[PDB]
Amino acid sequence: VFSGSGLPHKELAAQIARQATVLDSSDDFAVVFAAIGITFEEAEFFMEDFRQTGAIDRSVMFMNLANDPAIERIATPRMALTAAEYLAYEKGMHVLVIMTDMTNYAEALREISAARREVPGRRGYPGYLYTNLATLFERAGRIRGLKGSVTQIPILTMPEDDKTHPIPDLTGYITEGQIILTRELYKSGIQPPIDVLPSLSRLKDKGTGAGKTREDHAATMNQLFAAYAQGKQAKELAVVLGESALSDIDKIYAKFAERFENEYVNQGFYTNRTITETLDLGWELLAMLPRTELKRIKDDLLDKYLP
Amino acid sequence: VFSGSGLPHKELAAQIARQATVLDSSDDFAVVFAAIGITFEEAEFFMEDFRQTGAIDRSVMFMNLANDPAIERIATPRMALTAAEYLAYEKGMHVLVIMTDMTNYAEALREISAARREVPGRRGYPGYLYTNLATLFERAGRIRGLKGSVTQIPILTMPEDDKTHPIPDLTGYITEGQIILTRELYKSGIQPPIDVLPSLSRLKDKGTGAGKTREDHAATMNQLFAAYAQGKQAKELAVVLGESALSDIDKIYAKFAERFENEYVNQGFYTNRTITETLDLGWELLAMLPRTELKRIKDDLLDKYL
Amino acid sequence: VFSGSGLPHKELAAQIARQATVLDSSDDFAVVFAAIGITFEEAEFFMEDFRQTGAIDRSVMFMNLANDPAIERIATPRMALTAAEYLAYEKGMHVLVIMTDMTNYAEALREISAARREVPGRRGYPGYLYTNLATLFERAGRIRGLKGSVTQIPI
Amino acid sequence: RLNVNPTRMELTRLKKQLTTATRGHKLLKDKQDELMRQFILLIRKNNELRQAIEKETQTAMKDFVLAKSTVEEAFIDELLALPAENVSISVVEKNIMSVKVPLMNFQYDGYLHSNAELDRSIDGFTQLLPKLLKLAEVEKTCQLMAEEIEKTRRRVNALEYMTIPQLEETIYYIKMKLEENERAEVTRLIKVKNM
Amino acid sequence: TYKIGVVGDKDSVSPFRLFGFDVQHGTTKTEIRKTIDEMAKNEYGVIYITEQCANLVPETIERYKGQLTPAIILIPSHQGTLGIGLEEIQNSVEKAVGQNIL
Amino acid sequence: GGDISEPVTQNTLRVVKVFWGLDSSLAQKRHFPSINWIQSYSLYSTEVGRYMDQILQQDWSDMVTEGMRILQEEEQLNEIVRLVGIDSLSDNDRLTLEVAKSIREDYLQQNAFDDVDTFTSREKQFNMLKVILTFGKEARKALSLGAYFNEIMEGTVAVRERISRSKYIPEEELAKISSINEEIKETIQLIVS
Amino acid sequence: GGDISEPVTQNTLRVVKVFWGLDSSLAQKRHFPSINWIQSYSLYSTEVGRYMDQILQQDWSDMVTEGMRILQEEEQLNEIVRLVGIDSLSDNDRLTLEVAKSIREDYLQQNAFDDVDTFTSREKQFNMLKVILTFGKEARKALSLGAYFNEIMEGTVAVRERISRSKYIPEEELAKISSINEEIKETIQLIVSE
Amino acid sequence: GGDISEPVTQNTLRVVKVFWGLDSSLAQKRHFPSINWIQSYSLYSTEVGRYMDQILQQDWSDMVTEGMRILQEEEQLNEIVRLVGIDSLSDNDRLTLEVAKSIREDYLQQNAFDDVDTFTSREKQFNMLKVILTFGKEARKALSLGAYFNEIMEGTVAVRERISRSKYIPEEELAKISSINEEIKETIQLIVSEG
């Protein structure tokens, strides 16, 4: 989860921990929390949430706060992941690793490479920052003949809200996608404030479709991205000039982007939508557009789901 | 020549080498061709095109590949110029040196630089990049009382096509003018994609005029450059206001700029035009203009040349 | 006084220096004019405008030029304030300190810093540019039990 | 200031956009000034036509009202929709400075007892028809032009106060940011070389 | 070939039936708004409407003012005019040109 | 940071002949594959053009350059679309943006996870590209006769939609792709009248 | 340069829940304290909102929510003003700008050197902000009764100044701020008639 | 790139007293010397103006000051033209543009390759400026009582041509420039009575 200072990445991580259960089954999720140089209020938020949901008797937590020595943050994630890989690959559990703040891990790693007076890489960070980060994130997934699994949800704040900063940059090249929170959405009261366009999931293509989700998953997805992207572009022309001058189709797109952010994205941190409800909700948004504009979805799906 | 990756600067280089000449036949003309950091395919392209056209018998080639040692890359231009200064200032020939790529040369200069553990450096390139380019560029010109000359046409590529990059920027401080290749022109099909507006030759006034070229060379030049400038301008008014809002004179200019690109500069990399063919083609495009808009030129030239 | 090149901060400087006075009494006010790394023409303008108006009779001038070595350029305002502090705190005068150009001072401080192999801060200026400037300006004010004061106008 | 990647690629890209914005700024003000000069001519005939139409139409209406008062109501009701004439419109699209302007022309395809007074009122509506048409043509021309002037003016104001200043300030931030980090890395490389 | 519609009370706009014009009479706001909207969707060219009807539904009129078709033109009734149409001119003038030519 | 000014990219661009430049702006709209058709290049396009022209016996090299030129003009035309309204543009230039819109969406966009649109043979590519260009070349004809841009847009909403779906029809039904071609010429033929 | 991209500012904002962004433009316009009400935030706002709802036993949370909403709409509206003009705005949009103006000038702006304005108790903050919002709710209601935006401004000249000086009202005389509410209603309902 | 933010330029302007900045926008359109008359400055301008006030015993410093005042006003008038349109000209303001245009074209621009325009002495420089200024003087004075703007522009066609060609007038024929000056006075009264 790529976030920033002030944005609610806490509530977003807590929510997906409180609501994640796989379909076709009813199995548990043994989460493991790794606090890395975060404040007390940020750490206490998770524990006060884990007790209320009862997920604390199902978890193991490694606490390194801002008052704790900075160098300990180098070993902290390696502790949790070792605990995670243990529970999953040996005790056969479905583990969910939550680490924050990952930004604090890199800065602590920079403190050493600066103290050793090593040849510095970009922005003062060591030249092995990528590989070092890779030794953490790649410790996730499933292995053959074993029932246990480890799913990793690390969290970092982007310095200066900059995606091209060494920490969110290098992390992006490693992990299998990212979920990006934005201030422009958050100030607009959108909860959770996820900008879906720069966001990504690299393993979403084989984990969806018939047998996994509903058959119209991929089509509606790409159609929504295309519609929202041109929707944003339309409103971008709507504040500089009157809505009547632009094409009505563009105006429908503009109204689409309004509904998409407020209804689809803004579900709140305490709403649990099933995959059935999220997909049918998208069809109602796709409804506003004529079928000629829906160029991403095959005609067979159009005559089966679209109102 | 200022170019970029993807632009046809190798076809242009090859075209120049074959077509370049002095129009006095009583002067031995030669072409020193230096290839720097050049991939085998375009290195072969040059070598084969130099033979198929028989340009080799007039030229001396210096081929250096990209995978060859970086010291050779640095030495290649100086090997080509030493030959050029001998053929000209000792054997009295008119030598034309063509060098490409100069960006490849600069990269090797950086490689040897950090080998001596020297420190960068404007945008990565060593601080002595200016002199290091001057030491091989300034080796050209005509010497008093000495038959023959050394003329250079170094070709480089602009990283992401910005003239603020060290290689084009510093080169402009050592050379008198530049020829700019544009991706917009190339994508549209203009060959060679030479943008006339930002390109410049500081020493053109001396190589033209009666006895060198025709008398109308400077007049047609200034007129074409001006007409095209206002021609391209009338086009971007026709996209904002429509052709209806344009005056009848500007519509002609708009049509002028279009055909100036499709006929005058769009020669083709295998189309050789003499200085006379070029000049008269300029008049055919100037005839497009109203007579009232041609009063700028001397009426002496208007009468003799259409 | 924040100014720019080509602007008349020169005239504004000389004007204040010759018009500056208090409604206190006839003679307990003085002016310490410090010129820093400025051209000779600018200095001679100051020096003679003080001579013409007779403002020199109540003022002390420290004239440092642009061609004078960098370290002499950074030491100039410290000697000006030292004289000002003496006249104000030891002799009980109301001293007004005019200093220009501070930009020349910063460039001199910039040159000295790099000569000492020091790592530069924002925009190639010393990291201690704030503190260094603060060791000049904070030398102004009134002191309890002491007659007189030090007032600064950094141009 | 805009929020975007502080990169060399983005910088070089934004600077060319500034050049694009500046020329397009003037291109709009030439577009606006010459769109409005004709708008003055059009709106003058608009006021002249409407004030003309609004009185010929009224008198013809009241004449019909007065004439139908003396005639039996049922007679009038059946006289209407005889028709016996069908009138339709043919709209051609004319351009006035990148503005879609309608060009309207009339296209074609009475009981024995129509009183003299009634007939005076009936052809009084037929006398009106050509003048009501160009009132529709001119007004729509002016309406579609005024909205374009609004859009152009509003875009111009956006270009000058919002777009370009944000662009200039962003091209300044990234430019300085790149200049700072280069100083930082170079400075770091100096210490390393001593090792 | 496009069509022509007329909106107004009976005693004023009835003779327009003699030209093949679609002449209807709405008194409520919803009646006029609906007729105009359907006229626009079935591709009517010009819609002449009395000012005593246009005054009841202003929001829908300005919605089409920016469209090429239909053209909505305010004619008077037998009683007279409300001065809307001749002021809507002024509304468009000042919105574009700041000072008065009229 | 996506900055292609970095050494690895720049050094590679001087030793290779083909450059497929990906940018995030296209990727975020899920425009796949997100290749920048303006900054990308291929120094084999000339010789390849002649080759695939010979084995197809169709003016492919002329087709591919006219398609690229349209895209190149589109980039210059969009610069003012951002500034002035889209409707304000000339009729013969609004056709360019729509025929460029077709190249981007109907042809350039290609989902790798669609089992018909994962792969596209030379003949399907030809038939698809042929349709898109022949539409604009047929619409420009009517537009030069006096027909108006908007009038030929509404009358082609049935044939353009089929062009949008030309990506998704199997490689045993290429006759269905050229079915669209002669339909376009047919449709605009009674629109002009 | 007030550039908060500075590492110190950035490092700090990672470990604090409250950010008071001081604006140079507001300082030059003599808007003190120069706090950017759009950029600034407080991650205690939700919690404090609950606490003040039960210590005053009022709906303080909704008051500061509508109060911010008006300010946040003002920004959207101001951008339109510099494009088309203020007179292009409808009566509702022009009312919002005059309410938001009051929020800034009569509530947000707080002189720290005035003997009474330098401090404002919890209850005075309530009475002031209540009076401010009360005007907006009544004027909005007045517009729904056919009244025009211009008529509201002219007819409420006396009251709108009394609102502007409520911050100078002593803590001992807070009742003089409560009585403003009655005057606001009695005035605007009279305007609807007149 | 012409960016005077360069370390070399910035450090130079700290010690030099005269600044001649050359705009690139003036380079093309062939405005030579392309010295920007607004950004450029001289720290000697005041003293030089009073030195020449004695060598010529004329209000030369007053003319130079008025010459500049016309130019700065033009820039202020220029943005008024942009943001709003060319109207309203107010006659006087549009005249200031024409006088400034005269200063820019007939005085500021001089060809260094022209055989008489490559050098103009103080003698010639004075007379040339006096002619241009007296044109603006006599036109604004007749404008009030009472003439409309392009009445003057129609009757001053040939005389503004002489002012425009005063640059090429030989030094030994300096009297011809002085003859231009008093031709201006008679031609606007020629149409004042009757106009």
Numbering used by the authors:
A (entry chain F): 149 to 455
B (entry chain D): 149 to 454
C (entry chain E): 149 to 303
D (entry chain G): 2 to 110, 121 to 206
E (entry chain H): 2 to 103
F (entry chain C): 394 to 586
G (entry chain B): 394 to 587
H (entry chain A): 394 to 588
Task: Show me the paper's own sentences about this structure.
V-ATPases function as proton pumps in acidic organelles and plasma membranes of eukaryotic cells. Furthermore, E. hirae V-ATPase physiologically functions as an ion pump, similar to eukaryotic V-ATPases34353637, and is composed of nine subunits with amino acid sequences that are homologous to those of the corresponding subunits of eukaryotic V-ATPases638.
We thus designated the unique half-closed AHCBO'' pair of 3ADPV1 as the ‘half-closed' form. The shifted ‘ADP-bound' form was rather more similar to the observed ‘tight' conformation. The distances between the β-phosphate of ADP and the interacting residues in the ‘tight-like' form were slightly longer than those in the ‘ADP-bound' form, suggesting that the binding affinity for ADP of the ‘tight-like' form is lower than that of the ‘ADP-bound' form. Therefore, we inferred that the structure of 3ADPV1 corresponds to the state of waiting for ADP release (that is, ADP-release dwell) in the rotation.
